[PDB]
Amino acid sequence: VSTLIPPKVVSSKNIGSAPNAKRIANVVHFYKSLPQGPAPAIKANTRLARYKAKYFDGDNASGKPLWHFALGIIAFGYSMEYYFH
Amino acid sequence: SVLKNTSVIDKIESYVKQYKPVKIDASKQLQVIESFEKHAMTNAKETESLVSKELKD
């Protein structure tokens, strides 16, 4: 009876579609995300900070700390098993 | 002039001439036709403003 007009009705149509739900999701997931590894806090300073940078960081993550623990028992020979039970 | 017993053609010719102004055109649509357009400006610019904003956003 006349010229129908569904070419321009997306101003209220862009709310119910599924991609819009993902659209409003990931845009919030993007703006505050740190750009290039910023704010990594690589300078750890808490009590034994030196340990935090050699083995406690996790780059090595090997049996050295338990080796250090074992050597501590060895150095305590005349303190726990000798001169005492 | 092909009819030598004319007797009606002048009446018929006059009948054509009296109704020579048969009937005028009807350009009545001057308030509702643009009302379709006024919705057309409203929704298209609503769409265009959104898509222009969203393409850059």
Q: What is the DSSP string of B16-46?
A: HHHTSS--------SSSHHHHHHHHHHHHHH
Three-state SS for A5? coil
State the Cα–Cα distance between residues A56 and A45, nearest whole angstrom.
12
- Could you give the maximum distance between any two Cα atoms of chain B, in Å? 86
Distances (CA, A) of A69 to A66, A74, B11, B46: 5, 9, 132, 72
Q: Are A82 and A76 in contact (CB under 8 A)?
A: no
Best mutation target, B29, B38, B47, B53, to test chain A (most A CBs within 10 A): B47
Three-state SS for A51? helix
Q: Are B43 and A9 in contact (CB under 8 A)?
A: yes
Determine whether the interchain pair A11/B46 forms a contact, defined as Cβ–Cβ distance below 8 Å: yes
Token output for A77? 């020979």
Which residues, at least 6 apart from A7, have a Cβ–Cβ distance to it below 8 Å? B44, B47
Which structural technique was applied?
Answer: cryo-EM
State the Cα–Cα distance between residues A7 and A12, nearest whole angstrom.
12
Determine whether the interchain pair B47/A10 forms a contact, defined as Cβ–Cβ distance below 8 Å: yes
State the Cα–Cα distance between residues A68 and A63, nearest whole angstrom.
9
- Burial class of residue B14, CB neighbours in 10 A (0-12, 13-18, 19+): exposed
**Side-chain half-sphere of A70: how many Cα atoms within 13 Å?**
5
Q: Are A54 and A65 in contact (CB under 8 A)?
A: no
State the Cα–Cα distance between residues B6 and B2, nearest whole angstrom.
9
State the Cα–Cα distance between residues A11 and B43, nearest whole angstrom.
7
Of A2, A3, A10, the CB nearest to B50: A10
